[PDB]
Short mmCIF file of C-alpha atoms in Angstrom, two decimals:
data_model
loop_
_atom_site.label_atom_id
_atom_site.label_comp_id
_atom_site.label_asym_id
_atom_site.label_seq_id
_atom_site.Cartn_x
_atom_site.Cartn_y
_atom_site.Cartn_z
CA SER A 1 -6.80 25.96 -37.94
CA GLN A 2 -5.36 22.83 -36.22
CA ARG A 3 -3.80 21.67 -32.91
CA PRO A 4 -0.24 20.11 -33.49
CA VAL A 5 -0.48 18.59 -29.94
CA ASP A 6 -3.74 16.65 -29.20
CA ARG A 7 -3.04 13.87 -26.60
CA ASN A 8 -6.23 11.94 -27.71
CA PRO A 9 -7.52 11.16 -24.10
CA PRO A 10 -9.02 7.76 -22.90
CA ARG A 11 -12.78 8.17 -22.13
CA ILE A 12 -12.92 6.95 -18.47
CA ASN A 13 -15.76 4.65 -17.21
CA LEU A 14 -18.22 5.19 -14.31
CA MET A 15 -17.27 5.02 -10.57
CA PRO A 16 -19.03 2.76 -7.89
CA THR A 17 -21.89 4.00 -5.64
CA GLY A 18 -21.61 4.84 -1.90
CA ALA A 19 -19.02 7.28 -0.45
CA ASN A 20 -15.26 7.38 0.53
CA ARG A 21 -14.86 3.98 2.35
CA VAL A 22 -16.52 2.08 -0.59
CA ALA A 23 -13.79 3.34 -3.02
CA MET A 24 -10.71 2.60 -0.83
CA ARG A 25 -12.12 -0.37 1.25
CA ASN A 26 -10.17 -2.41 3.91
CA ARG A 27 -9.36 -6.12 3.11
CA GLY A 28 -6.27 -7.72 1.50
CA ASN A 29 -5.26 -5.70 -1.62
CA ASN A 30 -7.97 -3.09 -0.71
CA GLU A 31 -6.50 -2.28 2.77
CA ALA A 32 -2.95 -2.53 1.38
CA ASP A 33 -3.41 -0.13 -1.57
CA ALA A 34 -5.46 2.39 0.48
CA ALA A 35 -2.80 2.18 3.25
CA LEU A 36 0.35 2.75 1.09
CA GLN A 37 -1.22 5.64 -0.92
CA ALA A 38 -2.28 7.20 2.44
CA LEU A 39 1.36 6.78 3.69
CA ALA A 40 2.65 8.49 0.49
CA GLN A 41 0.37 11.56 0.98
CA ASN A 42 1.32 11.60 4.75
CA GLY A 43 4.90 11.99 3.42
CA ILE A 44 6.32 8.47 4.01
CA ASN A 45 8.16 7.47 0.77
CA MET A 46 7.04 4.19 -0.95
CA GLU A 47 10.59 2.77 -0.87
CA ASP A 48 11.17 3.55 2.87
CA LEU A 49 7.85 2.16 4.29
CA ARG A 50 8.11 -1.03 2.17
CA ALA A 51 11.84 -1.47 3.11
CA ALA A 52 10.95 -1.25 6.84
CA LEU A 53 7.99 -3.68 6.87
CA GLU A 54 9.52 -6.16 4.30
CA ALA A 55 12.69 -6.34 6.45
CA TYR A 56 10.42 -7.13 9.44
CA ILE A 57 8.69 -9.90 7.34
CA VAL A 58 11.97 -11.42 6.09
CA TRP A 59 14.82 -10.50 8.52
CA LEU A 60 12.48 -9.73 11.54
CA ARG A 61 14.00 -6.15 11.62
CA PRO A 62 11.71 -3.75 13.74
CA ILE A 63 9.92 -0.95 11.79
CA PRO A 64 11.30 2.61 12.70
CA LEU A 65 8.90 4.69 14.91
CA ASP A 66 8.06 7.16 12.04
CA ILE A 67 6.88 4.45 9.59
CA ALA A 68 5.47 2.27 12.47
CA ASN A 69 3.12 5.09 13.76
CA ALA A 70 2.21 5.95 10.12
CA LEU A 71 1.08 2.30 9.68
CA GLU A 72 -1.02 2.47 12.91
CA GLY A 73 -2.55 5.64 11.38
CA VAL A 74 -3.52 3.83 8.10
CA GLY A 75 -4.77 0.85 10.22
CA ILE A 76 -1.79 -1.54 9.75
CA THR A 77 -0.09 -3.13 12.79
CA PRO A 78 3.84 -2.89 12.69
CA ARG A 79 4.16 -5.89 15.10
CA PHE A 80 4.95 -9.62 14.79
CA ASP A 81 2.57 -11.49 17.12
CA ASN A 82 3.87 -14.85 15.87
CA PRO A 83 6.48 -14.73 12.98
CA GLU A 84 4.97 -17.86 11.31
CA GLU A 85 1.51 -16.20 11.16
CA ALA A 86 2.88 -12.68 10.56
CA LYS A 87 4.64 -13.66 7.27
CA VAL A 88 1.33 -14.83 5.61
CA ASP A 89 -1.71 -13.34 7.48
CA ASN A 90 -0.05 -10.00 8.41
CA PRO A 91 -1.50 -6.67 6.98
CA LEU A 92 2.27 -5.80 6.43
CA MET A 93 2.61 -8.73 3.94
CA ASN A 94 -0.32 -7.22 1.96
CA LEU A 95 1.51 -3.81 2.10
CA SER A 96 4.81 -5.41 0.81
CA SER A 97 2.98 -7.30 -2.01
CA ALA A 98 0.77 -4.34 -3.16
CA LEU A 99 3.66 -1.80 -2.95
CA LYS A 100 6.11 -4.08 -4.85
CA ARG A 101 3.56 -4.96 -7.64
CA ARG A 102 2.56 -1.30 -8.31
CA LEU A 103 6.35 -0.81 -8.97
CA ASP A 104 7.11 -4.29 -10.48
CA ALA A 105 4.27 -4.42 -13.08
#
């Protein structure tokens, strides 16, 4: 007997201690990654949410109410308090970076 298909799976390592919030976290890449994946399961497509926020970071184009409220749900603010600060310090700039790099890498 044999198996023609096999796959030969990678033996995964151990996960960190704690519960829920320790795995996803909320700071920089942590808040960004947790946010976008939460948007995807809420139904907001990766391309749409990123297009909205990135256009607000670059062109200063307001985020549509659907994506905007979805961001407020995942803890991100779809506003520009001060455009100079909100291009660098903004949770949206972490969302644009994390979402682009999970596609770009």
